[PDB]
Structure 1
Amino acid sequence: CGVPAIQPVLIVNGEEAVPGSWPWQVSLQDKTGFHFCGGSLINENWVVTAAHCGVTTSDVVVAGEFDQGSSSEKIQKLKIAKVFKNSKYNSLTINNDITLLKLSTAASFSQTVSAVCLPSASDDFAAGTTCVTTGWGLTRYANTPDRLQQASLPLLSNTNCKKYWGTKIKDAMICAGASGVSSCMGDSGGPLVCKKNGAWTLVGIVSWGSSTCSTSTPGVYARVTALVNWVQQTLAAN
């Protein structure tokens, strides 16, 4: 996990990613192929995304995709067998914004399709750490870009994030950005990864932020460390 077969070379103001350099990135689409959210593969049978994306078993997980405008590109359209929404998700405060998707048929890992590592509940990723977020969300606050995008951004301390968002920032949230880039419509559920001993680890899940996708305001993500115990328990019981 966390080691791309194809090394990446480093969303508003982001840049085009190297084809297949973020193998855990999946696209969540409806029965017609309409992209509504991103997601991250944590192993061959499970995808982790945001609770607010409202995924159902009628939706599909598309893995190994780079250019959504390419009908030739080889991808994997995985059916969803069951959806596990964290019962703690607060539809009012948006806290505990995480959902797990169990695939009907396992994904066939390869050079362009693999898993991201999960952190330990006790991991501490310091403010200032340069992480990365990826997705097919809008590049300007408007249709989604065809090719997967990426952006490097810094994690922010809770104190610094609150200087802007105040008490809307809850215990299962972590902020990053306000550095010239911003997540935007279509990026939700996607990953915010940072290196842990060299392996890309899921530190956040794109959740919410500026109503205008401003690049000078903190982006908010679901804090995976505060939710990974729930993830592990869900896996073990299913």
Structure 2
Amino acid sequence: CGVPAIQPVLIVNGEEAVPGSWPWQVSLQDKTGFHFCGGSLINENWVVTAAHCGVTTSDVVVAGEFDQGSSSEKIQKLKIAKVFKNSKYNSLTINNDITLLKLSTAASFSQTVSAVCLPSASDDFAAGTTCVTTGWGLTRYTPDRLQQASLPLLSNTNCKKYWGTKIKDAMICAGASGVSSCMGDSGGPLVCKKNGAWTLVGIVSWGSSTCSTSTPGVYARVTALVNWVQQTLAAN
């Protein structure tokens, strides 16, 4: 996991990514083909996304896509068998914002489709560390081509200076650096390189209503949720 066959070369104020360089990135589209959320492949049969994305079994998971306006890309449209919304998810506070999607049809891994790594519950990602987030969300307050942006992680204590008590333990902040995740990026990945491999540290969750690049974005903290992910995959 976490090692793209096509190496990446380094959302408001982001940049266009190298085609296929973020192989675990998927697009969640409704039956009309409308992109509404991002997601990350963790293996051939499961996708991790945000619980607030409100995915249903009528929605479709699209893997291997780069330019949503192109008809010549060999993409994979995968049906969803079951939606596992974390029972700890609190829609009022948006805490524990994670949902697992069990695919009815397994994804076919290739040079452009593969899995991201999950961290250990005890893994530490220090404030100041520069990570990357990707998605097809608005670039100005959606773009056809996949965007990317590097941004720093903040500590929860420092994040509270911005969001106060809205910041919970199962959340992690990043940004306030000139870039920002925005509507349509939700459910997508916030990855950091650890020991040579890209690890899923956060899931785009919420933030500034205007996608302000001076305010930090809030992501679901994967280290606080990985135990649930492990339990779910094991029992299903």
Structure 1 residue 159: Cα displacement: 1.3
Aligned length: 236
Structure 1 residue 236: Cα displacement: 0.1
Aligned equivalents of 2:68, 2:183: Cα separation in 1: 16
Structure 1 residue 187: Cα displacement: 0.1
Aligned equivalents of 1:33, 1:46: Cα separation in 2: 21
Gaps of 5+ in 2: none
Aligned equivalents of 2:230, 2:119: Cα separation in 1: 11
Structure 1 residue 158: Cα displacement: 0.9
TM-score (norm 1): 0.99
Structure 1 residue 164: Cα displacement: 0.7
Structure 1 residue 71: Cα displacement: 1.2
Aligned equivalents of 2:107, 2:149: Cα separation in 1: 26
Aligned-residue CA RMSD (Å): 0.4
Tell me which of 145, 150, 170 is aligned to 1:172. 170
Q: Deviations over 1:148-207 (max 9, x none)?
A: 000000000111101110100001000000000000110000000001101000000000
Q: Deviations over 1:36-90 (max 9, x none)?
A: 0000000000000000000010001000000000011110000000000001110
Structure 1 residue 212: Cα displacement: 0.3
TM-score (norm 2): 0.99
What pairs with 1:187-206 in structure 2 (closer than 5 Å)?
187-206=185-204
Structure 1 residue 31: Cα displacement: 1.1
Q: Percent identical across equivalent pairs?
A: 100
Aligned equivalents of 1:63, 1:133: Cα separation in 2: 17
Could you say what secondary structure the match of 2:161 adopts? helix
Flag as ranges the 4+ runs of structure 1 deviating above 6 A: none
Aligned equivalents of 1:197, 1:44: Cα separation in 2: 23
Aligned equivalents of 1:164, 1:190: Cα separation in 2: 22
Structure 1 residue 135: Cα displacement: 0.1
